[PDB]
Design an enzyme around this catalytic site. Structure first.
Site, PDB file in Angstrom:
ATOM      1  N   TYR A  38       0.798  -1.213   0.000  1.00  0.00           N
ATOM      2  CA  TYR A  38       0.000   0.000   0.000  1.00  0.00           C
ATOM      3  C   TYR A  38       0.831   1.263   0.000  1.00  0.00           C
ATOM      4  O   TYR A  38       2.026   1.249   0.317  1.00  0.00           O
ATOM      5  CB  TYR A  38      -0.918   0.024   1.227  1.00  0.00           C
ATOM      6  N   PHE A  49       2.462   9.794   3.081  1.00  0.00           N
ATOM      7  CA  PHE A  49       3.026   9.738   4.427  1.00  0.00           C
ATOM      8  C   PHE A  49       3.591   8.373   4.824  1.00  0.00           C
ATOM      9  O   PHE A  49       4.336   8.267   5.795  1.00  0.00           O
ATOM     10  CB  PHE A  49       1.982  10.202   5.458  1.00  0.00           C
ATOM     11  N   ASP A  50       3.257   7.332   4.070  1.00  0.00           N
ATOM     12  CA  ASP A  50       3.741   5.997   4.394  1.00  0.00           C
ATOM     13  C   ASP A  50       3.443   5.006   3.275  1.00  0.00           C
ATOM     14  O   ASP A  50       2.565   5.240   2.436  1.00  0.00           O
ATOM     15  CB  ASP A  50       3.093   5.541   5.708  1.00  0.00           C
ATOM     16  N   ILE A  69      -8.272   0.553  10.292  1.00  0.00           N
ATOM     17  CA  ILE A  69      -9.324   1.563  10.219  1.00  0.00           C
ATOM     18  C   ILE A  69     -10.476   0.966   9.419  1.00  0.00           C
ATOM     19  O   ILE A  69     -10.259   0.223   8.462  1.00  0.00           O
ATOM     20  CB  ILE A  69      -8.842   2.855   9.520  1.00  0.00           C
ATOM     21  N   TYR A  95      -9.327   7.849  11.020  1.00  0.00           N
ATOM     22  CA  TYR A  95      -8.922   8.104  12.390  1.00  0.00           C
ATOM     23  C   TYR A  95      -9.757   9.181  13.084  1.00  0.00           C
ATOM     24  O   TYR A  95      -9.333   9.750  14.093  1.00  0.00           O
ATOM     25  CB  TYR A  95      -7.443   8.478  12.421  1.00  0.00           C
ATOM     26  N   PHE A 112      -5.550   5.872  -0.160  1.00  0.00           N
ATOM     27  CA  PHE A 112      -4.680   4.701  -0.161  1.00  0.00           C
ATOM     28  C   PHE A 112      -4.753   3.944  -1.483  1.00  0.00           C
ATOM     29  O   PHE A 112      -5.824   3.783  -2.069  1.00  0.00           O
ATOM     30  CB  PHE A 112      -5.092   3.714   0.941  1.00  0.00           C
TER      31      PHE A 112
HETATM   32  C1  FK5 Z   1       0.952  -0.390  17.859  1.00  0.00           C
HETATM   33  C2  FK5 Z   1       1.742  -1.231  17.084  1.00  0.00           C
HETATM   34  C3  FK5 Z   1       2.247  -0.798  15.863  1.00  0.00           C
HETATM   35  C4  FK5 Z   1       1.550  -1.485  14.687  1.00  0.00           C
HETATM   36  C5  FK5 Z   1       2.254  -1.127  13.378  1.00  0.00           C
HETATM   37  C6  FK5 Z   1       2.510  -2.112  12.430  1.00  0.00           C
HETATM   38  C7  FK5 Z   1       2.117  -3.567  12.688  1.00  0.00           C
HETATM   39  C8  FK5 Z   1       3.198  -1.737  11.116  1.00  0.00           C
HETATM   40  C9  FK5 Z   1       2.133  -1.360  10.086  1.00  0.00           C
HETATM   41  C10 FK5 Z   1       2.706  -1.407   8.668  1.00  0.00           C
HETATM   42  C11 FK5 Z   1       1.545   0.017  10.404  1.00  0.00           C
HETATM   43  C12 FK5 Z   1       2.530   1.115   9.994  1.00  0.00           C
HETATM   44  O1  FK5 Z   1       3.722   1.080  10.792  1.00  0.00           O
HETATM   45  C13 FK5 Z   1       4.714   1.913  10.188  1.00  0.00           C
HETATM   46  C14 FK5 Z   1       1.880   2.490  10.053  1.00  0.00           C
HETATM   47  O2  FK5 Z   1       0.814   2.511   9.092  1.00  0.00           O
HETATM   48  C15 FK5 Z   1       0.282   3.830   8.938  1.00  0.00           C
HETATM   49  O3  FK5 Z   1       1.326   4.722   8.538  1.00  0.00           O
HETATM   50  C16 FK5 Z   1      -0.788   3.808   7.845  1.00  0.00           C
HETATM   51  O4  FK5 Z   1      -0.500   4.129   6.693  1.00  0.00           O
HETATM   52  C17 FK5 Z   1      -2.222   3.371   8.154  1.00  0.00           C
HETATM   53  O5  FK5 Z   1      -3.092   4.222   8.330  1.00  0.00           O
HETATM   54  N1  FK5 Z   1      -2.547   2.082   8.218  1.00  0.00           N
HETATM   55  C18 FK5 Z   1      -1.532   1.030   7.987  1.00  0.00           C
HETATM   56  C19 FK5 Z   1      -2.034   0.099   6.881  1.00  0.00           C
HETATM   57  C20 FK5 Z   1      -3.443  -0.406   7.202  1.00  0.00           C
HETATM   58  C21 FK5 Z   1      -4.407   0.771   7.372  1.00  0.00           C
HETATM   59  C22 FK5 Z   1      -3.938   1.694   8.498  1.00  0.00           C
HETATM   60  C23 FK5 Z   1      -4.046   0.962   9.839  1.00  0.00           C
HETATM   61  O6  FK5 Z   1      -5.133   0.518  10.203  1.00  0.00           O
HETATM   62  O7  FK5 Z   1      -2.954   0.813  10.637  1.00  0.00           O
HETATM   63  C24 FK5 Z   1      -3.255   0.003  11.786  1.00  0.00           C
HETATM   64  C25 FK5 Z   1      -3.932   0.783  12.915  1.00  0.00           C
HETATM   65  C26 FK5 Z   1      -3.275   2.027  13.517  1.00  0.00           C
HETATM   66  C27 FK5 Z   1      -5.154   0.321  13.390  1.00  0.00           C
HETATM   67  C28 FK5 Z   1      -5.912   1.005  14.529  1.00  0.00           C
HETATM   68  C29 FK5 Z   1      -6.446  -0.100  15.446  1.00  0.00           C
HETATM   69  C30 FK5 Z   1      -7.333   0.470  16.553  1.00  0.00           C
HETATM   70  C31 FK5 Z   1      -8.467   1.282  15.925  1.00  0.00           C
HETATM   71  O8  FK5 Z   1      -9.318   1.773  16.963  1.00  0.00           O
HETATM   72  C32 FK5 Z   1      -7.887   2.444  15.114  1.00  0.00           C
HETATM   73  O9  FK5 Z   1      -8.953   3.234  14.566  1.00  0.00           O
HETATM   74  C33 FK5 Z   1      -9.431   4.166  15.538  1.00  0.00           C
HETATM   75  C34 FK5 Z   1      -7.071   1.835  13.970  1.00  0.00           C
HETATM   76  C35 FK5 Z   1      -1.987  -0.663  12.325  1.00  0.00           C
HETATM   77  C36 FK5 Z   1      -1.422  -1.625  11.277  1.00  0.00           C
HETATM   78  C37 FK5 Z   1      -2.249  -1.372  13.658  1.00  0.00           C
HETATM   79  O10 FK5 Z   1      -3.263  -2.367  13.494  1.00  0.00           O
HETATM   80  C38 FK5 Z   1      -0.990  -2.036  14.220  1.00  0.00           C
HETATM   81  C39 FK5 Z   1       0.096  -1.018  14.579  1.00  0.00           C
HETATM   82  O11 FK5 Z   1      -0.185   0.170  14.734  1.00  0.00           O
HETATM   83  C40 FK5 Z   1      -0.312   4.321  10.259  1.00  0.00           C
HETATM   84  C41 FK5 Z   1      -0.824   5.756  10.112  1.00  0.00           C
HETATM   85  C42 FK5 Z   1       0.753   4.260  11.356  1.00  0.00           C
HETATM   86  C43 FK5 Z   1       1.319   2.841  11.423  1.00  0.00           C
HETATM   87  O12 FK5 Z   1       2.352   2.816  12.417  1.00  0.00           O
HETATM   88  C44 FK5 Z   1       1.760   2.935  13.713  1.00  0.00           C
END
Ligand code: FK5
Length: 123
Positions: A38, A49-50, A69, A95, A112
């Site tokens: 992605y 941003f990523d 999300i 978010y 995305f």
């Molecule tokens: C804490 C452990 C670290 C763990 C990090 C990893 C495994 C590495 C993995 C590649 C994530 C990336 O690590 C560089 C990076 O991906 C972002 O840059 C991004 O592009 C993004 O938006 N993504 C990632 C791709 C899927 C969609 C979304 C996401 O859903 O991400 C998920 C997310 C935050 C979900 C929450 C869950 C709770 C809900 O309540 C909330 O909604 C309110 C949404 C991520 C995968 C979490 O499940 C697990 C984590 O966070 C985030 C901006 C910041 C995130 O790093 C933090």
């Protein structure tokens, strides 16, 4: 070409860039481990941003388990293996007002590009 509105309110709109493999067996199901690549950017600035390509490590998660999300669960559950798409996700399915870290402000619309590489059923 094919632009798809996945939610009645239009908070999640998916534009298909490349259609995937035909077959119900090529559609991921709830609970399945999904593997994708992605690229994410903020619609407000248009800047990326990523991306899983920064690390060159495909991203894996379980479909519709609250791991990602809401917009992502909705979009990926509608994709076929090998499909490439662009999805516009409004804050409500992203978010929200909270935002994420200091990379994603509150009330941000997210863009995305997702490529569904594969998925597998567990247990
Ligand atoms: C804490 C452990 C670290 C763990 C990090 C990893 C495994 C590495 C993995 C590649 C994530 C990336 O690590 C560089 C990076 O991906 C972002 O840059 C991004 O592009 C993004 O938006 N993504 C990632 C791709 C899927 C969609 C979304 C996401 O859903 O991400 C998920 C997310 C935050 C979900 C929450 C869950 C709770 C809900 O309540 C909330 O909604 C309110 C949404 C991520 C995968 C979490 O499940 C697990 C984590 O966070 C985030 C901006 C910041 C995130 O790093 C933090």
């Amino acid at each position: 070409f094919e632009k798809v509105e996945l939610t009645a309110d239009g908070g999640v709109i998916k534009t298909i860039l490349k259609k995937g493999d035909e077959g119900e067996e090529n559609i991921p199901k709830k609970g399945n481990e999904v593997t994708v690549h992605y690229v994410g950017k903020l619609e407000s600035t248009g800047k990326v941003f990523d991306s899983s390509f920064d690390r060159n490590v495909p991203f894996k998660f379980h479909l519709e388990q609250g791991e990602v999300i809401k917009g992502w669960d909705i979009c990926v559950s509608s994709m076929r293996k090998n499909e490439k798409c662009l999805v516009r996700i409004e804050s409500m399915y992203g978010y929200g007002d909270e935002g994420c870290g200091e990379s994603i402000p509150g009330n941000s619309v997210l863009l995305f590009e997702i490529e569904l590489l594969s998925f597998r059923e567990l247990e």
